[PDB]
């Protein structure tokens with residue numbers, strides 16, 4: 001997050017590109033400040049005229065640039081009031097461009113995760129594989145795949161919600177690597193059988209808490225017709 | 233089997249089971265053409281000990297007899313004692329499938345439809361979805377008689393009932409089938425007071441018992 005000499009307050013990515021700006025260019029001597037009212041504004045050289053504002057209210061709050069990517073203004077209670085949205089979704093290597101990855105099930109029973117990195121022209125390059133495991137390691141019959149930054153690294157991670165033959169459930173997480181690949185999945189959460197069922201869960205990834213780390217929400221459909229939203 | 237005189241031939245047996253296997257008291261049967269081979273056959277919703285539901289199908293032999301059954305659908309999420317299965321082609325596939333009318337403890341009821349499909353060469357019923365539902369106390373499953381068929385002639389089977397109302401009135405309702413096997417709202421038909429038509433004194437002609 002930088003304020004340019006030309007008065008334009010901007011946020012740039014690791015790709016060197018600008019993701020967001022106030023557009024207050026040409027106002028040389030302009031300054032950006034965070035007021036006691038809790039808002040973030042850009043003021044002209046005269047120290048009086050406002051050129052841009054987030055128009056928020058949050059006394060005792062603060063403006064924080066997160067490692068996840070974007071700039072968020074938070075109140076005294078730690079609740080987000082406003083965000084620039086300057087983030088790149090599922091950027092696995094942290095190079096400033098979104099990527100995509102897939103779980104590939106081979107006919108011989110083994111599986112691996114393949115990553116397609118984004119190019120400078122918006123195209124997707126040839127996949128590389130990581131976490132290639134032997135047959136019999138995963139029983140890939142009843143599992144759901146999620147993406148997102150679950151560590152607050154600044155680079156995307158992945159997760160798998162899987163049911164087991166004993167009706168138990170586990171949620172696996174694999175951290176993104178700088179090379180665009182993934183590390184081994186580890187259990188991030190688990191429950192004894194009789195708690196949650198894979199056939200009813202409909203997980204969603206995203207930052208629902210606003211704490212700077214992605215998390216998981218589930219639209220759980222009960223056998224009796226009732227519905228509840230669960231948050232992890 | 234039937235002759236061209238409208239008469240029936242002598243009965244012959246085909247499929248059979250030893251004593252201690254299939255219990256008649258746990259069998260709720262429906263019939264229809266579930267794989268579209270041009271022959272109607274049987275399916276059984278069996279009460280599996282703990283009142284879970286396991287559905288068997290008994291494909292018809294070319295000679296009119298029946299072959300060894302196989303399981304097409306099973307669920308432990310629903311109580312067998314509260315299920316009343318019905319058969320018909322509810323999406324116009326050309327092959328019949330089944331729905332289950334379920335009487336909830338809450339006083340409400342619903343119909344779950346399981347469409348017939350073939351996946352990886354294997355015939356089975358697909359995942360159940362709710363196609364009809366009512367408020368609690370709106371319908372009593374023990375006070376109405378069910379019969380399926382294609383009532384508007386649009387090629388998709390649907391169901392209609394004669395229900396006995398609290399005031400003794402008998403009313404016809406029909407729920408037509410949408411292309412996605414979802415049901416429409418019930419459409420009222422003929423009705424009468426108990427002084428004309430007595431509910432408990434009439435039985436409908438059906439294709440399968442209860």
Ligand SMILES: CC(=O)N[C@@H]1[C@H](O[C@H]2[C@@H](O)[C@@H](CO)O[C@H](O)[C@@H]2NC(C)=O)O[C@H](C(=O)O)[C@@H](O[C@H]2O[C@H](CO)[C@H](O)[C@H](O)[C@H]2NC(C)=O)[C@@H]1NC(C)=O
Nearest residue numbers: 141142163164165166167198199306307308309357358359
């Ligand atoms: C036969 C059936 O209805 N199975 C249930 C469920 O069916 C769906 C569902 O899995 C969705 C989403 O994953 O994908 C398809 O639509 C499935 N449909 C068919 C026709 O297969 O599948 C789950 C499932 O976990 O696949 C069943 O639960 C069973 O499988 C788990 C995981 O392997 C485990 O083996 C359980 O022991 C086994 N559970 C039970 C209770 O037998 C669903 N089963 C029920 C009863 O609802």
